Amino acid sequence: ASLPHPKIVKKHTKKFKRHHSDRYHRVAENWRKQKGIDSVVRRRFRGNISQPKIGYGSNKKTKFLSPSGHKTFLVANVKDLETLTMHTKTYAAEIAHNISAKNRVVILARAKALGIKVTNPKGRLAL
Amino acid sequence: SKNSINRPKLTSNLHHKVHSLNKKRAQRERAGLLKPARSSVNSKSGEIKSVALDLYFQNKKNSITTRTLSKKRAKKIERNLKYATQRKLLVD
Amino acid sequence: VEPVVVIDGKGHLVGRLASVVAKQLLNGQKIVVVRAEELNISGEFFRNKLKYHDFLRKATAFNKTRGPFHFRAPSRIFYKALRGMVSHKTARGKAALERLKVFEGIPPPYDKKKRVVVPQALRVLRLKPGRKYTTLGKLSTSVGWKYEDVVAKLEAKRKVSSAEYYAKKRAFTKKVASANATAAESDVAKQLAALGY
Amino acid sequence: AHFKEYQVIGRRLPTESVPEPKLFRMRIFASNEVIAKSRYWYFLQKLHKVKKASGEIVSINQINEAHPTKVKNFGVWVRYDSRSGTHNMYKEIRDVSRVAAVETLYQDMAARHRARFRSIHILKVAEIEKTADVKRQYVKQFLTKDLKFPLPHRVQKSTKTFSYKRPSTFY
Amino acid sequence: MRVRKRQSRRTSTKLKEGIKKKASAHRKKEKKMAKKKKDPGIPSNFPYKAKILEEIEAKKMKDLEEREL
Amino acid sequence: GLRSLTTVWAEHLSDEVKRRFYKNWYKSKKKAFTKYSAKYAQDGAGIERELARIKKYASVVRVLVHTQIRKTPLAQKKAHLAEIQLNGGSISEKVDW
Amino acid sequence: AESHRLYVKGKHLSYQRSKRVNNPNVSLIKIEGVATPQDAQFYLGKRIAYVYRASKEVRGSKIRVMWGKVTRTHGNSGVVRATFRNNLPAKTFGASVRIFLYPSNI
RNA sequence: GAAAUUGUUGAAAGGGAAGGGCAUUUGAUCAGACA
RNA sequence: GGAAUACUGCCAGCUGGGACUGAGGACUGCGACGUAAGUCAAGGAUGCUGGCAUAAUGGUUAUAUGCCGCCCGUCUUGAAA
RNA sequence: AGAACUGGCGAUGCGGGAUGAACCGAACGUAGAGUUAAGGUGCCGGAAUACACGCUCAUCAGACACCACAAAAGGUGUUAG
RNA sequence: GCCCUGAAAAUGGAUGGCGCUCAAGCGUGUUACCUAUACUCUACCGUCAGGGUUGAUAUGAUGCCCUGACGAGUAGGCAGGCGUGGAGGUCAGUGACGAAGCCUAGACCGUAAGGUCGGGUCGAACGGCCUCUAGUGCAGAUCUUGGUGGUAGUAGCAAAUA
RNA sequence: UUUGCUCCACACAAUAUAGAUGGAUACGAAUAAGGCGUCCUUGUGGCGUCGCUGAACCAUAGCAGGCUAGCAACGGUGCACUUGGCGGAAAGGCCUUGGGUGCUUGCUGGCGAAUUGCAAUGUCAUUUUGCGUGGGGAUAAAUCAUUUGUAUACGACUUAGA
């Protein structure tokens, strides 16, 4: 269960790779605006990669919701988790990557007690 | 082709390819190299995937060695499991 | 509607038949063209022989073994006319062309199969009377194809056998026509007549 | 398009120095009212210096055939401006209505003398009252007694791509 | 026999646009040069010639009957 | 084009031809025409069938000959086999010859 | 009987396309026996199946079906435009589809 | 103990490029939820 | 002499078929039908039902197919090379 | 060739002209549906081997721009005047 | 008017190709039909503009709500952000039950800069937020230093008798 | 070769779709002409009739087609046999003899069908390979190495060797 929302539509599901990120290892896939005066990518020719522009902005009513319908919140300890006690249908706590296993089981205990959804409960747990 | 215009060539190759492709796929599926169904008891959907953990429990249950468990990680898993068993011991 | 359409080539115009067949193939239909040597082209014989020689000039200058290949048989002239009407350099075009078979004469098993005509490519219904035309077998023989006499011989043989077949079938349909006319006045026959049958 | 025949009646705008100016009428063939009325103004420009802004249209009325089911021999009188000068022509058109005869003549001018609808001037169209007065053999060949002709080599239009019979050009 | 080369009918872009330039130049030169009827026409094969002739000859009176009071 | 319709061989073939059918004659069991000589045993019904087929359908008859290469000074023992076309006489006469 | 068919045979012709741009979201289906656009108005709304087989025995069956519907006519020769929930692969240009009689207006 | 680069294994493609865009087939893989 | 029909135009005439969309989220408005309470198609979709409940939909991914697809950058805007 | 003005390109994609600085079309966020422009509808290729009136047969037709050139003429080709 | 001739060489090729001849050519008429990032309608994004909002039993007034129109872009202008080393403050932040780093067709958020999580590896430190500061972000410069390929098991190892 | 290989009778694994789902349903020739039926004096004959499309023709009813009772005909049709003839263009098909067993919707009866829950292709071919299931038939070569020189840069070629 989550706070009600419409369908989560993503106007561009594919990642915006950089122009020649495939041709060269030295060119990363991190997006970069092509600044060349004769860049067919910048001039927006037919048959080239799409570039980010504000038209692809997600719906404001849905912009930060995960597929479960929650906005993700990073928690590192029980104290951080309890800030979502009154916001349980609008937020789901995600446990930070560096929280140790014992502190993670403490977090899961408190989260289940408060009913807060935890995004990655499987975590470092190898019971 | 241009020498044998009355034989299908592309279509014959595509039929042969689809036959050999799913014969190979079925051979792989019967040997069980493919992962089981999501509803299977042997599947790991929704649960963490770890080469090290799988090898540790395969050595405890008692080969493939491209997937190898280091003695370092084996000791770490044993220590973590001791902690987890102590936690279940304080639970019960 | 048929699974394979065996088109009789005789009396058909090369381009118009080629276009019809090409659109049939691209639509998923299997076409066989038989008697490619009695297929027709518009224009006098000399004009089409000249156009073929114009095609026959073309050859890779540095290595003639990789130039245009000038296939002489009427099936291959029709096939060339048809391959230009299909994007044959793709997998779709190659797949569609492999739904086509073209032959000189009528070899088995199609001699025992029904042959159709494409009226929108039939010279009779298309090409205005009095206008000259070219029969493809003459053109192929004139520009190199060396099996016209063979196909003529085998076609004469096939016509003899098929004439025997048709004589038998006409005898049998005479018998069946007599039978259906002898039952043509019964109660059930009149009932079928009331229903347009 | 498919033609209609109009009368278009106009006059110059009245003045203190002239009330009720002369009324001028032309029979005009056009697809619709607007083309016909412009046609009127163009011809009235050429005939004498009457500007469209200086005059008006007092009427416009479609003219129909008195007997639109009686085949007539039409004698049509045409001047035009194609392709290198100006000409007179006279064409016989055996036809039923004046508008059909005019449309046939416009098609003939487009076909042979390569002239557009704006290049063709219909001067007079007349039903030849007497068949002895027809002058063109291509029309006078249908006037003969007990006329019969076959339609040899019938081509049957086929709605099917394939046929299972060799077609026949009979009757 | 030995059919010769046939000229291409595939026009070039360069040739075609050059023709456009030539045609525009020809229009302008024709206007510059240009800056430096004998038929009423009642046709001799129209059948009703005499009738329309007589009708319009009767209409030559109006051009001189009325103009003077 | 022309097409080989059928081929009928003699009952007994020498070693010189049989050598032509092996790359490794000395190693072989020399089984060259062992299942084919039997077609002459059953009163030659298959042999007669293919000869009648040649008579019925063939428009060109070619005989198969070979050289008695042992008669030459050559060291080669593998004889040379060829098709020689028969001219003259009708098809039936060619086959009977 | 020996005929059990409740569908009209069709053919997948091409996507909706220009000379140099196609559009996979709309597909062109040629229905057998339909030769004019006014004949094709019958089949608008009917469900189309592209029934194709595979090798995995997925969900109790080795035969897979793509579902779609007839949306409008196309041209003057009886071609109709159809849209599927998953657009038909381009390898099926020339593949037989099935146009069922439901939903009915008869 | 990165990348370039390489070996082996598994999968796959390949009829004189490779790569990239949109869409979908197919194969492999994979996340989430309880009137 | 009497019509009819075509053509054009109009109807705040009736009635079917198909497709896409369902934004918004108590009420407030203008209306309509009503004898009235009320009801309504009137300031944006609801009702009833079935199947599955997982790799089925979906994503990632390898590909295959259809169509598109200078090779980036600099400098030259003129072959714009 | 000079002057004067106005448009186009520069900085600019997209549809069409097979192709493309100078042509035709076209108010560039992300999509869906409909309708179109210019160009087209035998096949390649989405779309009538549509209807209709004529003309034309070219022993290398034409599909093409045209007060453009070769272009003024030559022809027992055909058609209308 | 259409047709033919009305000159023009040199690799084999071009109405774009096939091909077309009562056309699939030419002139014209009538329609139907195909199709753009254009037009109409709707949704979503952003900008701009016009209204409304201290009302508290409610939070954030550069916030919220309603309404409409718009959206190309080099130089350049303005604005909002993402990332990195070090500093002041704070979370009595994370960490040997594993910090950082690295690898990963495993996941999620963002239009994007990027951010988050899972697994493997690792073994001792490192983050969020408010600020401060700068040796702060690379695809190029025949860039610098280092490393590594194809070429390629290729050229070659043939002068001076063996 | 634990009898490898091949050809015959079943049970299922793996199945495969450039795209099965009633039937590719056979004169030739002409098109300013022909098809069919009939007759004689057998013709380029006479007479009649037909097209103007296959919108045809054949099939077509049954649990995806069950279990049974009869009537009427002796027809049609399936299957495995078998008789003879024809087909070499790529014949791999066509026709025919006889018995055997089914079916028959040509006609009349009796019982079953449900719940797949209002649709989801709702799977109905063969396509083959094979672990096997029980009866048959079959008992070689090629290459390297050696050699030859009719050949040869090396491969290759041409010979010889139980």
Side-chain angles (χ1 to χ4, degrees), chain A residues 87-107:
Chain A
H87 304 296
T88 300
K89 293 187 286 185
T90 61
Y91 277 115
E94 199 174 18
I95 290 183
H97 68 300
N98 45 5
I99 316 302
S100 64
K102 60 196 297 279
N103 304 113
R104 286 205 199 220
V105 298
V106 179
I107 301 181

Side-chain angles (χ1 to χ4, degrees), chain A residues 40-53:
Chain A
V40 297
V41 189
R42 186 201 62 80
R43 300 152 85 182
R44 280 187 316 246
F45 270 48
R46 200 185 46 171
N48 276 92
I49 73 166
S50 57
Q51 318 189 130
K53 44 179 77 165

